[PDB]
Amino acid sequence: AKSRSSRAGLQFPVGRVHRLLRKGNYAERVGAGAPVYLAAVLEYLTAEILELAGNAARDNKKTRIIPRHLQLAIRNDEELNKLLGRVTIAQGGVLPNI
Amino acid sequence: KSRSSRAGLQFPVGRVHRLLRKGNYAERVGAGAPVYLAAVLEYLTAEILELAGNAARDNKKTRIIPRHLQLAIRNDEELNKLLGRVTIAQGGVLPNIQAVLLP
Amino acid sequence: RKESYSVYVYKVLKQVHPDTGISSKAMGIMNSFVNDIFERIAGEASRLAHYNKRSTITSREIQTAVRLLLPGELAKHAVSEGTKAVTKYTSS
Amino acid sequence: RKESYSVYVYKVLKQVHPDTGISSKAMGIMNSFVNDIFERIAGEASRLAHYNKRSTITSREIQTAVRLLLPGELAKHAVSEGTKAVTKYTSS
Amino acid sequence: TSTVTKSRRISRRPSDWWVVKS
Amino acid sequence: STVTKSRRISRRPSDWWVVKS
Amino acid sequence: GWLKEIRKLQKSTHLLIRKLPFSRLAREICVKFTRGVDFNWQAQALLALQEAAEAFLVHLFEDAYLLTLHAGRVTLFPKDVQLARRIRGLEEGL
Amino acid sequence: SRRRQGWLKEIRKLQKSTHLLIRKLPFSRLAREICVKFTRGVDFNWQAQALLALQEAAEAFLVHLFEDAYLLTLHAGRVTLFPKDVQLARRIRGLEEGL
Amino acid sequence: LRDNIQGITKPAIRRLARRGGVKRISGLIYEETRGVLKVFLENVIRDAVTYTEHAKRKTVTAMDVVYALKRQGRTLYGFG
Amino acid sequence: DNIQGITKPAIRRLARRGGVKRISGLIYEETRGVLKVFLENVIRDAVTYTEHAKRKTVTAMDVVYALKRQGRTLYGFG
DNA sequence: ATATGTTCACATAAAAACTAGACAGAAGCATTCTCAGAAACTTCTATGTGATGTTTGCATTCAACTCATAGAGTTGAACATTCCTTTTCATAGAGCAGTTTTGAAACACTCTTTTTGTAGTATCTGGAATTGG
DNA sequence: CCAATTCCAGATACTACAAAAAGAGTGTTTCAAAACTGCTCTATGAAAAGGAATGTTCAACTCTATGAGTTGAATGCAAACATCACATAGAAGTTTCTGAGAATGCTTCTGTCTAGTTTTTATGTGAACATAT
């Protein structure tokens, strides 16, 4: 009668993350606040990437995001480039470097 | 009547079985998986110990020290590729000097 | 029947940009990113719980794993977001 | 009240070199090596079992993980030793 | 240059992280 | 360059960064 | 001439190697490993393999040209690629 | 003639031993200073084995980095090491192995 | 040409080098590039075929390639 | 000035064990900075591991785990 | 001429041999769960065609490169001396870590019902191409 | 080179629906707080010796401009094959169902791995005899 993701004031699902934690054989028990914490972190990272992707798309007179915009947004950020250091984006290209 | 003796091994089978059961790997464990794992572990240990003993004997010694383990590991391409990101304490380096520097 | 994170990504996109769309390959890339980060954090929390002889995964393990995995300002803001979310969820 | 592989390493050494000893630091290094290899193989077998939607770890998963992890000749000889031990164990 | 996204997190561009600076 | 108890040839890691025909 | 070519290629995102030669090479390498049996291939698998290979090659060329500029030249040599593979350390350069 | 090549015998002797090269007390002082700069105001204790392991790891890292940097130096056509060699070695090793 | 390794032509290698930022290339680069590509493909294809024949299938799937690349330390996001 | 405790002869010994023949004067400060960055990263990870548990003493296993989490394995202190 | 290689006493921190004894491992049976075997069918992969136009292969060349050498300037290894800083042999004090109980709160397990992501289907439009200015 | 038109592939919008997750209750288990014990980290004292610090010097190293030898990016033209549209058969990947064998939970009996003693022991240290560079 009331979603847990709305209880936490989020958009990502909480019950699905809880089930995926329970069925991933990570430990024999799972707490109650761990899925909320994980969903909040995931939603924050998603929003952070999507804002820069939308900015990169707007700076090219486009109204739809393509993998090139995601590549630009990820490689033009310091901490995001540090986090995704061993990841390859398909159809993303490279950054213009002389 | 031991399982290790039944499989003709020196490494323990019950201990590996218990470690697999209490390691958060899967809900069920078979019967030949611990035997297979113990056999592989014993084979690797025997290879390393033989190479280290040969190194120590050629070095005119009687006891194996970490230096001999380093010399044995870094002189075998497959063992070197397996332990590529491992550091051995008090092991030192191999005596490798560039030929351009030496006259 | 398959499962993905498309609806939630679209929701947060409409939240951050009301007049912008997205392709299908970009959505697949976002799904892969979410799955990768999930796996990283969950594995780190599991091994943390194993090191200290515990059989439960709590928000403390998640916070420690986030502090260990993300760079500085990202980790600070993610910790703040998670703490705020847990505090809001508890008072209900 | 601690566990190690000292007695088994000593038995293997006596089988290989009957007139050679070993220090304590080398024994600690050997214990570390055994634990590392165990952890690697078990994790790879778990991942393999999860990919194909199975809830059991059998000798086939161990064999495939050994083939995936070790280089060529080491993998061949390890598979030989493993199947030999299995067929000797099941015939009793 | 930089970018101040929501939550006021300054998004900086990578630089020469391989040079020692005092 | 060395034959152990089992007949596995233990070779020295000579070179791996050069393309050989 | 070369400058416009580089500036145009650094802006596009399409694959640079043809599909049929890559498919033939991958199929022959795959049939070399098995016991003579012929395996079928999906199109997405070959596409992913080509994407990964091309990304790897472009990054290796970037590193090799860094080494070339350090050596004091402007022309790329095979020893630059070899030294980059060696410095990458047995896991990334191979 | 004072000494033709003493560096040769020095290298040949140093590549045969396996003992630590940095003193223990300055290393302990530096480690404690950094650790107290990380924590807010608390002063943490340190086991001896922890400091020994840290020193071993640091010295191994430095020796390997020096090997790679001298490879780059010899590629550049020189016999003297420069800081640019270390910088380029870190850059090519990448974000993790190059810090 | 007739050999399958010769199907990777000089224009394609030149385009890859130009995308990488290279300005001037030598003649001996193409064979080295072919050899490096061959080693890369051999490793990835061996791992993928192992993953494929672990299950009782006869068709190579994109997920096998993704798993091989991931276990070798190279994550791919597009074909997940 | 604890960073100055790492003297010039010690850096010389490290470079000589690494195989270096000649060293320039500007290298000691660079080496000090690199060592400082390495120590900062490892000590941050180890202190996080230590304070996750309710302890106030850094142990060897904390350092081992901190090194392992960065792609470096140590065998002597297991 | 000197570090190098080899040789003998010694005692000693270190390795090695005994023991007993909690605790981890083995034997045996009923329960329950899982993965292999069989039949079908439908999607996706292999194969042939027509054109083909699109791209590549081959021959020159000369302006743009690489490579070897020598002179001007810079500097790091080698060495005498000294004294300061690290190392070694005792020495507790006590702050902090390790062990044992337990119980109240937190987490797992089960049946029901609703609501939300999914799979198809029907419309709308951003983006790519071509031509002309 | 940019701007405008038109087309269509690829988005958005729109519904049924079925299965997954809250709601509520019940049984299990586990981890923090308290008391006790011990343990090793830290701060202190007294010698001491050898290794770091200063200063100077000179042969060894780097930088740079230049001439001699090599080559590959640009260009024109003829050939040819990766592509694409279309078609098309059929192989095997997937789904559903069934059933025998293996893992498991539990208990009782055994044998063994490890901590506490307690007996030997390679080898570093000191000093001395030939020797290649």
Q: What is the CATH number of the domain that holds D42?
A: 1.10.20.10
Phi, psi of J5, rounded to the nearest 5 degrees: -65, -25
Q: Which amino acid is at I60?
A: V
Is there contact between A18 and strand L, defined as CB under 7 Å from any strand atom?
yes
Strands D21-22 and B63-64: parallel
**Residue G63, number of CB atoms within 10 A of its CB:** 22
Q: Nearest nucleotide, C1' to the C-alpha of A63? A: K126
The three-state secondary structure class of B28 is strand
What phi and psi, each to the nearest 5 degrees, are found at residue H11? -65, -40
Q: How far apart are CA J3 and CA H27, in angstroms?
A: 9
What domains appear along chain H, each with residue ranges and CATH number?
19-94 (1.10.20.10)
Can you tell me the distance from the alpha carbon of D33 to that of B48, in angstroms, rounded to the nearest whole number?
A: 10
On whether the CB atoms of residues G58 and I7 are closer than 8 A, the answer is no
Instruction: Tell me which residue in A21, A47, A53 faces C42 most closely, judged by beta carbons.
Output: A21
Residue span of the structural domain in which D69 resides: 1-92
- How many helices (H) and strands (E) chain F has is answered by 0, 0
Q: Using N-to-C axis directions, what is the helix angle for H48-75 and J8-17, rounded to 10°? A: 60
| Torsion angle defined by CA atoms of residues B9, D80, I68 and G24, in that order, rounded to the nearest 10 degrees | 180
Q: Residues of C with CB below 8 A from I78's CB?
A: 25, 28-29, 32
For residue G6, give the nearest of A98, I10, A69 by alpha carbon: A98
Do residues I62 and G45 lie in contact, with contact meaning Cβ atoms separated by under 8 Å? yes
Structure-token pair, residue C55: 């059989």
Amino acid at C34: V
Q: Retrieve residue B68's tokens.
A: 């001999």
Does residue B2 reach within 7 angstroms of strand L, measured from its CB? yes
For strand K, is any atom closer than 7 Å to the CB of I59?
yes
**Of J34, J28, J39, nearest in space to J4 by CA:** J28
CA H88 to chain centre: 17
Residues contacting residue B50 through CB under 8 Å, at least 6 positions apart: D16, D17, F4, F5
Shortest Cα distance, chain G CAs vs residue F17, angstroms = 6
User: Which residues, 6 or more positions from D55, have their beta carbon under 8 angstroms from its beta carbon?
Assistant: B26, B27, B28, D49
The answer to whether the CB atoms of H94 and A85 lie below 8 A apart is yes
- C-alpha span between E22 and E18 (Å, rounded): 13
Instruction: Tell me how far apart the alpha carbons of residues I43 and I74 are, in angstroms, rounded to a whole number.
Output: 13
Mutation site for D-interface testing, chosen from B40, B44, B74, B81 by largest number of D Cβ within 10 Å = B40
| β partners of residue H80 | J22
Resolution, angstroms, 1 dp: 2.4
I34 sits within 7 Å of strand L by its CB = no
Calpha distance H95→H91 (Å, rounded): 7
Q: Measuring CA to CA, how many Å separate H19 from each of H22, J14, J17?
A: 10, 11, 11
Whether residue G51 lies within 8 A of chain I, CB to CB, comes out as yes
Is G93 within 8 Å of F18 when comparing Cβ atoms? no
| Any F CB within 8 A of I43 CB | no
**Method for structure elucidation:** cryo-EM
Q: Which of B29, C42, D46, C27 is nearest to A19 (CA)?
A: C42
Quote the number of domains for chain C: 1
Q: Residue A68 — φ and ψ, nearest 5°?
A: -60, -40
Q: Name the E strands within chain D.
A: 21-22, 56-57
Q: Please state the domain count of chain I.
A: 1
- The CATH topology of domain B1-98 is Histone, subunit A (1.10.20)
- Name the residue with tokens 């220090």: D23
Residue I51: CATH number of its domain: 1.10.20.10
Least Cα distance to H43 among J41, J46, J56 occurs for J56
H23 touches strand K (CB under 7 A): yes
- Count the helices and strands in chain G (H runs, E runs): 4, 2
* A-I contacts at Cβ under 8 angstroms: 22
CA distance J77 to A16: 41
**A62 CA – L7 C1', rounded, Å:** 20
| Domain, as residue range, for J7 | 1-78
Answer for I4: CB within 7 Å of strand K: no
Which one of C5, C20, C53 makes the best mutation probe of the A interface by having the most chain A beta carbons within 10 Å?
C20
Residue C56 CA to residue C50 CA, distance in Å, equals: 9
Place of tokens 């099941």: D90
